[PDB]
Structure 1
């Protein structure tokens, strides 16, 4: 029942060109409709819109640090170690991805591929061209430009000039079959934007922010070692947990598949994971709304090694609370079901 509640299930949205042109306000729109409570939403951009003319001219693009994803575990509980490989071009990455050893296996519908994924993730370790600095948007595209979204996350750079690779700048991800991202919320529990430029699909699991603590508790239970060492160990982005285990332990979750040309928005304190079906290319970065600031103040951070100083955000957007907050006496409690204040117009 908390399991099935559609107020917390993954929504898809199909904006007009008109509504698509204003990024930050469409985000408030989708929150006005409950998008946020799943932790993950799909936005299908209008059909005419193309961020780039052709993807035929990137064969020579360098993937500086491809990673080979070794996974270890059994009984739905795994740990992924990314081993660094020599630099290769996109062309050489495509070659390995499409070969007999690494290609997508044969399958009828998504559930079969899903079973193949969870059965074989420890075998035949694929290479993921992850975290490449760069963007495939053409210089001139003013709608949903992952390299320049212009949200209030940019306040750190206005005031200091300081950027953080991947959070304030764009990353590309060249996937092949079975390459994975572990269970995680974003750095500083930010929002994220992920756009599949081309190729085979990317499937995603998301846990609703209102139930995120349950996933932490499950993860503590089955990795107490990792949890002694570091209260926020999910932030290492190394832990995979199967849908069967989530179901079994009462963690509500939902699933969706992202196809070429679609955007996925992850929301504050939204745990997600997933894998690629086959050769593909996705771009992402982080962003913020006014709602994020409290998530930023309260984010439980890695206690054993990325950190945004919230002072500037509280100063600008929460001026009266600032002194009370620096005192350590600001016990604002987050309601994860609430839309951002920018949504108020859509009522």
Structure 2
């Protein structure tokens, strides 16, 4: 078995290898990359996402989110307080202000220490889930707005045509902005390109050990667990690497820098934080290997999760027994 320790693997495709997206995902899996839950892909030196990022300041962040924490330094939840709209130029200025800017630090490890020590005492503002793309339309390789759709994958594999669409989202981050422990909707893959700015640190649990993380989360967030059998779908819970280690949860960590792709694999729990002002683009995707994960994916039906239009068909076709209860949750 390849990659039996479930290490995060890093890939350096050639420009020739970078032509066929599906083929390269399959290649990574042949080397055991999926066992980690997360892989890094460094594009060939000849590749670029777009010419420059000099003209992005007028993009609107319609609903910036202030991420307010509750709990203790290593075990906390966050809720999102809506703020007034601002442009990316305004957001960048805010990120760089004395109140929100990255503190002096020695290296990534020092900054990680500061993050887990001090995150809960601040409330950074995140411009997340903005529909759009920063890939040039002429970028033919690994263009996240030109991937095969999940709906077409399901049709190719299972023979049924379904409604729905599948487009990328932009994320503008600042120091301490946080993504909570989660797997993707319907335990899909995700791919994330860091377009510009400061790094993003990721934590990930191997898919074969996801239930260990779920069990710990139930113990650490007991009220939340009683409220919903799949409350990590709410994407509000954080657990530090120290607490994971104390509880014997297998995980890995890696820092993504500008110009690098990350892929998360089906049922790979992940969480992390941004180092400073940055912009990432991400989208979900599927492969034939995903179908069995989609069939088995947990669902939130308590009403909190509330997801895309397109998830309806996934649940309807892959999980018909769960569909009625889930759909009630979506109203």
TM-score, normalised to structure 1, is: 0.85
* Cα deviation, residue 154, structure 1: 3.2
**Is the CA contact 2:10–2:39 (under 8 Å) kept in the aligned structure 1?**
yes
Against the structure 1 CA distance between its residues 153 and 243, is the aligned structure 2 distance closer, same or farther, given a 3 Å change threshold?
Answer: farther
Distance 2:275 2:315 in 1: 41
The residue aligned with 1:336 is none
* Cα deviation, residue 308, structure 1: 4.2
**Is the CA contact 1:59–1:89 (under 8 Å) kept in the aligned structure 2?**
yes
Could you list the per-position Cα deviations for residues 16-51 of structure 1 after superposition, in whole angstroms to 9, with x for gaps in the alignment? 010111001100000000100000000001011111
Distance 1:11 1:59 in 2: 34
* Cα deviation, residue 147, structure 1: 1.1
* Cα deviation, residue 312, structure 1: 8.3
* Cα deviation, residue 140, structure 1: 1.8
Aligned partner (choices 99, 102, 111) of residue 101 of structure 1: 99
Could you list the per-position Cα deviations for residues 191-236 of structure 1 after superposition, in whole angstroms to 9, with x for gaps in the alignment? 0000000110000000001111000000001112111111000000
Secondary structure, aligned partner of 2:115: helix
The residue aligned with 2:72 is 74
Tell me which stretches of 4 or more aligned residues in structure 1 moved more than 6 Å.
311-314, 325-328
The residue aligned with 1:55 is 53
Distance 2:99 2:126 in 1: 15
Distance 2:48 2:224 in 1: 44
Could you list the per-position Cα deviations for residues 75-94 of structure 1 after superposition, in whole angstroms to 9, with x for gaps in the alignment? 51100111111110011000
**Is the CA contact 2:102–2:175 (under 8 Å) kept in the aligned structure 1?**
yes
* Cα deviation, residue 170, structure 1: 0.6
* Cα deviation, residue 153, structure 1: 4.2
The residue aligned with 2:203 is 205
The residue aligned with 2:329 is none
Could you list the per-position Cα deviations for residues 47-73 of structure 1 after superposition, in whole angstroms to 9, with x for gaps in the alignment? 111111010101111011110111111
Secondary structure, aligned partner of 1:226: helix
The residue aligned with 2:281 is 283
Structure 1: give runs of 5+ residues left out of the alignment: 315-324, 329-347
Against the structure 1 CA distance between its residues 25 and 308, is the aligned structure 2 distance closer, same or farther, given a 3 Å change threshold?
Answer: farther
Distance 1:129 1:194 in 2: 15
TM-score, normalised to structure 2, is: 0.89
Secondary structure, aligned partner of 2:16: helix
**Is the CA contact 2:73–2:118 (under 8 Å) kept in the aligned structure 1?**
no
Structure 2: give runs of 5+ residues left out of the alignment: 323-331
The residue aligned with 2:117 is 119
Secondary structure, aligned partner of 1:117: helix
Secondary structure, aligned partner of 1:31: helix
Distance 1:247 1:239 in 2: 17
Q: Superposition RMSD on alpha carbons, in Å?
A: 2.0
* Cα deviation, residue 186, structure 1: 0.3
Against the structure 1 CA distance between its residues 155 and 27, is the aligned structure 2 distance closer, same or farther, given a 3 Å change threshold?
Answer: closer
Q: How many residues align?
A: 310
**Is the CA contact 1:153–1:289 (under 8 Å) kept in the aligned structure 2?**
no
